Design a protein around this ligand. Structure first.
Ligand SMILES: CCCCCCCC/C=C\CCCCCCCC(=O)O[C@H](COC(=O)CCCCCCCCCCCCCCC)COP(=O)(O)OC[C@@H](O)CO
Ligand SMILES: CCCCCCCC/C=C\CCCCCCCC(=O)O[C@H](COC(=O)CCCCCCCCCCCCCCC)COP(=O)(O)OC[C@@H](O)CO
Ligand SMILES: CCCCCCCC/C=C\CCCCCCCC(=O)O[C@H](COC(=O)CCCCCCCCCCCCCCC)COP(=O)(O)OC[C@@H](O)CO
Ligand SMILES: CCCCCCCC/C=C\CCCCCCCC(=O)O[C@H](COC(=O)CCCCCCCCCCCCCCC)COP(=O)(O)OC[C@@H](O)CO
Ligand SMILES: CCCCCCCC/C=C\CCCCCCCC(=O)O[C@H](COC(=O)CCCCCCCCCCCCCCC)COP(=O)(O)OC[C@@H](O)CO
Ligand SMILES: CCCCCCCC/C=C\CCCCCCCC(=O)O[C@H](COC(=O)CCCCCCCCCCCCCCC)COP(=O)(O)OC[C@@H](O)CO
Ligand SMILES: CCCCCCCC/C=C\CCCCCCCC(=O)O[C@H](COC(=O)CCCCCCCCCCCCCCC)COP(=O)(O)OC[C@@H](O)CO
Ligand SMILES: Nc1ncnc2c1ncn2[C@@H]1O[C@@H]2COP(=O)(O)O[C@H]2[C@H]1O
Ligand SMILES: Nc1ncnc2c1ncn2[C@@H]1O[C@@H]2COP(=O)(O)O[C@H]2[C@H]1O
Ligand SMILES: Nc1ncnc2c1ncn2[C@@H]1O[C@@H]2COP(=O)(O)O[C@H]2[C@H]1O
Ligand SMILES: Nc1ncnc2c1ncn2[C@@H]1O[C@@H]2COP(=O)(O)O[C@H]2[C@H]1O
Lengths: 389, 389, 389, 389
């Protein structure tokens, strides 16, 4: 549903309202004007979200729900006790722990952590500036100019810049300053770390592939291999990057279980299926057993697949590329094949050698049957086995 | 035991006492008041821990135990020789090397390194501030205000902020300042590095899973596959994340040896065990041989497991989900199965085709027997083999 | 082709011209002198590149092509509206997205990202300094001295140094300063992250190898193994690092498909091929079947390969190193073999035990046949099988 | 040899002398006193190392050898031309590229890179401070106090601290300052990156093991397994960490080739070898064939290995731990076995069931024979096969 979503958003806005008012009031008690209605509404939202959640871990919600702030603000309390209203916070923890699940997949987790941290940083800067322009000699100056200098200071401190135009004078100012410096250096170490971890995973494939190619190459040069083969290999890896980004079909489809892998394979070879069982008569238990045995392979341009005098024994189904057939030795082409078709069948149904030569024309992406396996699951079905003659 | 633990804690507190007194005294010799008893107790603790340890590597303990400080403090020594009392340190090395083993597993090692580094940082700041408010023109000012400005300075320096409100005047001040700047830039590089390494390993599974899904998807789109199958795959991966966090059963149980793997499997299928060998009569050497051959598999909602005209030859044991049985083609359901039950048995004990259809209702988590293996270890036990008829 | 390349370079230079003039003019309207021709040429280049691209994603090109700047500059517009000329930017996005593909392989992607980021940084510094020396009390000072102080300021800010020699005075200055501080701390976090990710992948092999050796060693010492064997192992790993950088032949050649792997293997063992089939008569279907079964192995100096009383049954082809033959027990050497040669043949074609002993002399890199496989694919070809007698 | 080593060290010291004198002279021409002998010696060392190297890449050595500095220093040259003496540098590149190989293995490569970078940093700081105290109004002040302030400045700049006590006044000063700021921010990004990469690889095993345990656990809890088995598993992983640091024997010994693996295995089971072939009569071709088939396994305390009514068919050799034998059901122990011994033999040489029960007493580390393999390579040797009766 969405009501829980909009509700959590309302809780977020409420805790923001509190995080921003609480301290600004502790400094400027001239607020708490006929503006308590919003405080009451927010307290009600929190005390009405604590049960929903029920529909250690719940300790923050309990500490945030009770109005430990309305008292201190209504009945004037002194400086060291006027604090403890911040207990109305600690709901930000629940907010983060909720929105890290509501939005746990659609975006990188590191990015989400980074944004949360930045929000936390800015709220803390707002609180720290309030604390600073509290620890200052009282003067007659507008509250919009006392708050600007404080934000300027705490941002030059948290940022590790430190101009030096406005500095501590009294000791307590100095202790506050020390603590803020440490939190800034500790708040600036987290940002950099999250960012580094976020960029160290952007270009993964374009690094894995690069390392794999470097490995292959650096290994071949030790074997003192010709540059032509090196160039063929490099072209192969380029073609394998600019289509599927470097991934191998088998290792991938192995990450899936049997039914989904079968459905994939049956959505791939569907065309071939409507080009084989036409005059055969089988189906639904034979097509589904070989299809998991088809192993892929890629033949570059000009590479020989089948020669006119061998006994390969296998059969090849094309999926993407093209192919040309030729005579044994006179480079005369019978025809040209393309996707969907198939060849290598005779030497399977029949134990004769090959009758022609097969040379590719461009980068193929075809599949093949070992025939030890294909002939093994044919014997098991004797009807088609008789159909082959 | 715990006596060694509390003892190491006492040694830690003692070396802390020394790290904090040693320099503060070197600056303020007005200490060394009738406060030597604590120094004697700590020297005794160190000289009494050096033998326990015995119950290069031991060089620091030897240099820390001898009272090279009590002399210098008792018999007044000049400024360049009043040093060398810090030899009482170097016990922090033993402390770190001990507590990195006492607490080596219950918490992340990087976190522990980070906390140790921060403690080392603060102690060094305390020492550096002492050194600074030594290298200052002598004046009549309280010692609590001379120590605050020094800590403020060295924290603005180590932090890489550098306001500029208090700076070096004399040359030796300037050399001290240079060294502190370098140590700060070298002390601030370690913190950031530890933090980055600590956040680069929080969300591991939620990154491995994400990359695996991106790979699968980006590979399928190249094969021009329908979006329905893509959605089924995504739902599968979601269900596989929100239960076991992305981990595969086989790859995991493979990280264990044979006895623990067997005990696991026998705690899992225990229910099935009390639903099979009832009227059989076997046990303790047959149940324990098949159980290691049960391979898991997951069938999504609506996926066909068994059809009314095939010869699957296998048998399926359910563990978590549910299932429905149906006729061949008229979508009439005989009954509904749930966890603990089993089906697919007839075509195993008997070589007939299937008699019905089996379609899942929700995400199953079931197990299956190949039957090549099951029928192979049945033949080996001829008694049950006759029991099957 | 190259015309598209030089064209994209021209587009890059044009968008640079704009990024550098646009703001410098907004500050110094005394420009827009008889210097509009270059602006017209650049607008034409952009409006003429938008169609080529055609030969969301295209939104930036559309916003950059229309002359939303020529109006504002021709007809004088006020300060808050004189902006929006920067819409002529956003072409840098297309520039980056184009040059990240044009140069996606020849250099590390991280390095490219880093250089792009640095360029973006410097352009932003140029814009920010213009913005700063706009938000300054008007004075009579040369424009080359007002622009230097601004660049100095924004570089001391973006860099997180913050001397403090020139600072904000007015509030709007202060808000600008806050924003620049945040962007600097956010612009300095990206640089460090990219750099860390760029150095964390330089020494990969020299780290993988090191870890593998540490693992092997630390495992052996637990088994209380002699140091001699440890030294032999270390020498082996050194020799395996200083030739092929730690990579194993099989795992590597497995990253290739069958045809390229076959061509590799046939370029390697080519010499052996012209030393075997001389008096045999086979070829093109037997040489090509065993060659994929040759498994490599490395024998250190002094290691026994074959002893005079065993029945190894295998045959060894040498590729790089040398070897010595010897009698059974009297250390008398018959001859010495080197690369290209072969031995171990008799016990293959004949089922007698070995006749001599074979000890290496230096680090060999040889290959061997199991003979279960070699004798299996020989039977399949009965002609040579009769040729062996 | 070592002469080349000491020679490279001399070259290093010479290029250091030059890097430190060259600029300090360019600033203080009052040097070049009767101190030219050292310059001549260093030029000779460089011009005499250029040929040794011979016993693009050599361009730096050629540019460093010719005395492009002795002229400028002898015949007074003006300020913009008095430069180009730094060409005597660029030998540091050869120094780094040499010492990165001389010391490429004994220490982590990242540490070495870091130290090189730090040295480069300090030399650059020395040069930059010279350049700075050149770009200063000439005054009457000692050269040891003009050089201290410059080093202080450039270290507060390179470090990203920036106090602000001494700043640029003139424009050229300001441009120098800008460049130094960028180099510092670019010199401080490299240090942090190297450090992060150096700490991200310290605790590898103690992280891999931790992740593996988290995976196993988090997977079991989903299967709702008892806590007793969980505790047994945790104890197993602890014992497996505190002996061999988490590494598996098979995966490790698989990183070695056949001869070294054989020699390892024959140094391990050597005791067993002198406890088996005593009354047998075999050797050197039977012991060496089974030893590679022994598979390891670990049985925790109290785990049953063999029960008095099964037909395990296998045999177990102990290596480290202990074991107890017992009757079928009355917990009466016949004897107690320890390392070196063996059991499970009868049911191998004979096809009877087991005669007793075997329960471990502590963490064992034993090995076992499948017996399908052991009985297969026994048949091949018929002599011992008759010896078994
Ligand atoms: C995000 C969390 C961070 C947000 C914190 C805001 C606190 C600011 C409140 C400042 C109110 C203090 C001002 C005040 O009470 O005025 C009377 C004088 O007080 C005075 O002399 C003394 C007032 C200055 C001393 C400030 C101490 C801060 C106490 C930290 C408590 C919460 C920390 C953790 C929150 C999650
Ligand atoms: C993000 C962009 C935010 C932009 C925020 C724009 C806010 C611009 C308002 C200026 C008000 C100036 C009026 C000055 C009134 C002066 C009269 C006065 O003394 O009023 C006081 C109350 O006011 C006051 O404490 C009011 C002064 C403080 C108001 C500042 C609150 C901004 C919170 C910052 C959140 C950052 C977190 C990210 C006492 O009775
Ligand atoms: C954590 C370790 C870091 C903690 C170090 C504290 C040393 C501070 C002691 C300062 C005492 C120096 C003050 C002193 O002796 O007074 C007479 C004047 O001295 C003077 O003019 C000169 C005194 C100032 C010179 C300070 C030099 C510091 C020597 C570093 C030695 C240990 C370094 C490594 C410790 C592990
Ligand atoms: C973590 C929080 C720690 C809070 C520490 C709170 C400490 C607060 C005490 C103030 C004392 C002020 C009294 C000033 C007395 C002035 C009279 C005087 O001259 O006494 C001198 C001795 O005192 C002196 O050297 C005493 C002055 C120095 C005392 C400061 C030691 C604090 C150690 C810091 C450890 C940080 C490491 C993390 C000479 O005879
Ligand atoms: C790379 C992108 C960053 C490059 C940005 C350059 C903008 C600088 C233009 C400055 C022109 C402002 C000066 C001006 O208009 O003069 C009249 C007075 O204005 C005044 O009082 C007020 C002028 C100062 C206020 C400056 C606000 C900057 C607005 C940011 C818009 C683009 C941001 C994103 C660009 C990709
Ligand atoms: C990379 C190295 C770049 C070196 C750049 C060297 C540039 C050196 C030119 C100095 C001009 C000094 C003449 C001063 C003329 C003063 C007379 C005057 O007022 O002219 C104004 C126009 O000039 C002006 O706005 C001109 C003043 C501003 C000129 C500065 C533009 C440089 C862009 C920086 C790009 C950095 C991005 C990486 C008004 O009518
Ligand atoms: C490590 C490499 C870095 C080490 C560089 C040291 C250069 C310092 C030499 C300074 C000599 C300049 C001083 C000089 O020549 O005096 C006459 C006045 O010059 C003047 O007004 C002008 C002198 C100040 C201008 C300094 C420009 C530096 C040129 C950079 C050249 C090498 C860069 C790369 C080296 C690998
Ligand atoms: N004229 C042709 N046009 C297209 N394909 C052919 C032609 N002649 C033979 N082939 C195919 O090429 C294959 C090569 O030899 P096979 O015996 O494997 O079976 C052959 C046929 O499938
Ligand atoms: N009426 C039924 N209720 C539940 N399960 C059934 C029913 N009829 C058949 N089955 C099971 O469904 C299986 C499908 O075909 P099998 O031959 O494998 O064996 C069958 C039985 O185990
Ligand atoms: N005199 C020799 N010179 C070179 N190689 C030899 C000599 N005698 C035997 N060999 C080879 O050494 C091999 C060792 O025993 P094989 O039976 O395997 O076959 C033997 C021959 O190939
Ligand atoms: N009394 C004994 N003391 C020690 N080992 C024994 C004793 N009796 C039997 N065993 C061993 O325990 C083994 C258990 O059954 P096996 O048939 O495998 O062979 C047995 C012997 O090797």
């Amino acid at each position: 549903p969405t009501y829980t979503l909009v509700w959590k958003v309302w809780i977020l806005a409420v805790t923001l309202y509190y995080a921003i008012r609480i301290p600004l009031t502790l400094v400027f008690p001239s607020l708490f004007s006929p503006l308590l209605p919003l405080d009451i509404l927010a307290s009600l939202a929190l005390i009405a979200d604590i049960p929903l959640d029920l529909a250690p871990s719940r300790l923050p919600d309990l500490l945030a729900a009770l109005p430990l702030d309305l008292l201190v603000f209504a009945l004037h309390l002194p400086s060291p006790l006027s604090l403890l209203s911040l207990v109305r916070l600690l709901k930000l923890i629940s907010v983060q722990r909720s929105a890290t699940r509501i939005l746990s997949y659609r975006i990188n987790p590191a990015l989400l952590r980074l944004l949360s941290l930045v929000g936390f940083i800015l709220l803390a800067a707002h609180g720290i500036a309030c604390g600073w322009m509290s620890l200052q000699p009282p003067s007659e100056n507008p509250a919009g100019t006392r708050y600007l200098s404080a934000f300027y200071w705490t941002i030059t401190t948290l940022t590790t810049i430190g101009y030096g135009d406005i500095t501590p004078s009294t000791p307590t100012q100095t202790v506050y300053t020390i603590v803020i410096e440490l939190l800034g250096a500790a708040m600036y170490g987290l940002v950099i770390g999250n960012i580094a971890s976020l960029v160290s995973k952007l270009d993964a494939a374009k690094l894995l592939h690069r390392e794999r190619v470097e490995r292959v190459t650096a290994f071949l040069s030790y074997k003192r291999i010709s540059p032509e083969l090196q160039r063929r290999i490099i072209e192969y890896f380029d073609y394998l990057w600019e289509t599927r980004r470097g991934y191998e079909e088998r290792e991938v489809l192995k990450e899936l279980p049997h039914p989904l892998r079968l459905a994939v394979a049956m959505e791939i070879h569907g065309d071939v299926i409507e080009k084989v069982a036409l005059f055969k008569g089988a189906g639904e238990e034979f097509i589904r057993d070989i299809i998991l045995h088809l192993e892929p392979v890629i033949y570059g341009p000009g590479e020989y697949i089948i020669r006119a005098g061998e006994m390969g024994s296998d059969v090849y189904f094309i999926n993407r590329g093209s192919v040309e057939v030729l005579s044994a030795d006179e480079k005369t082409r019978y025809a040209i094949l393309s996707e969907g078709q198939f060849f290598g069948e005779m030497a399977l149904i029949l134990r004769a050698p090959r009758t022609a030569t097969v040379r590719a024309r461009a980068f193929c992406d075809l599949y093949r049957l070992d025939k030890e396996t294909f002939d093994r699951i044919l014997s098991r079905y004797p009807e088609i086995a008789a159909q082959i003659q």
